[PDB]
Ligand binder design. Sequence first.
Ligand SMILES: [Mg+2]
Ligand SMILES: [Mg+2]
Ligand code: NA
Length: 327
Amino acid sequence: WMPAYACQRPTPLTHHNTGLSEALEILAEAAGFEGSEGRLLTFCRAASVLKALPSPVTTLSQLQGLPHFGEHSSRVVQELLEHGVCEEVERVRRSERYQTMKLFTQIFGVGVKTADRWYREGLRTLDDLREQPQKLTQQQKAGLQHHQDLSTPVLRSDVDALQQVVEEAVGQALPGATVTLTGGFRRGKLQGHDVDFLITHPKEGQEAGLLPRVMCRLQDQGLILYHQAFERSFCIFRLPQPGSWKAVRVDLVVAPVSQFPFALLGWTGSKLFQRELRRFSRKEKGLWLNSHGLFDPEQKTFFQAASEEDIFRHLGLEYLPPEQRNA
DNA sequence: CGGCATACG
DNA sequence: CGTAT
DNA sequence: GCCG
Ligand SMILES: [Mg+2]
Ligand SMILES: [Mg+2]
Ligand code: NA
C-alpha cells in the first residue's frame, strides 16, 4: 500500500499529517547538525511517508507496515498522539545547539561544518559574526548583510516580476533562449526562500557560454546585489518593492536542450524526491541518474529523453507531475 | 553489516 | 569549503 | 534510523 521509495508515490504539497511530519523533520534537521546523514535520511523518509497518506494518522497501529517507521519514529508519533508533544523534539527545539546551528546554517555561505566550528568557538548570534568580519568569506559577508531580507518569504507575485527581467536579459544574451521556472514554485508552492530558473536554447550548442553573458547584463542593469565559464549562478537579486526594494536569492542554471529534461527533473525537486529517485534508479534499475542524463553502465550508453515523462518511463515509474513530487 | 544522490562554484 | 534540487 |  505504501512503496518504500518516495519517487514511487504521489506526495502533495499539503496533506493530512502536517504536525507529525514537522516533528520528524526537526529530528532530521538536528541529525544533520551533528553529521548523522543516515539518521537524517530515515527521519526525512518517515516524514515524507506521512505526507503521502490519504488521511490523518490517529492511532499507533496505523503505522504498522509503513516503511521507515521503526522504534524511534514510531515512539515520536506515539507521544504526539497521546500528549500532543514529543519530549525529545521539544528538547531539540529549545537547545542552544539546535537554535544556533539553525541560525548559522541559514546564512548564505555558511554550511554545517562552518557553523559547527563557530559554535565550538563560543559564537552564538549574528552580531557575534559581524563583530569579527575578518574571518568571513566574501560570500558569507553578503549572506550576513542581506540575512534579514533573505529570511522574508518570496511570494509568487515576486517570481513573475523576476522572470520577466531574467527573460529580458536572456533575450539579449541569446535570442531564442528560454527561461523555465523550476524549484519549489514549479511544485506549486505559494511562498519560498529563493527562485530557481532553468535556461536553455532549442538549438543544441547555442547555450554554450550563455550564463556569463546573462550575468553581465543583469549586473549592468543594476539588479545583482551579489554573485560569484560556468553553468550555475547563485545570485542575490534586487527586487523592487513599494517605494523601495528587497534582496532575493535567485538561482540561474543553463543546460543544453538534449539534457533539459534531466535538468528540469533535477531542479524541480524536491531534494528528497531526487535523492530517492537517484537511489531507486541505481539500486533497483542499475541505472545512474543525475541532472545531466541517465547512464546505463552495462551498455555504456546514455538514455535520450525528450521530456520528464520519458525519464519516468525509462525508470519503470508511473509519471508524477511536479505538484506530486513534494516528498 | 553496508548503504544512504549527485552534481557544480 | 560553499552552493543546488 | 531504518531496509534489504
Ligand atoms: Mg528553490
Ligand atoms: Mg535555489
Ligand atoms: Na547556508
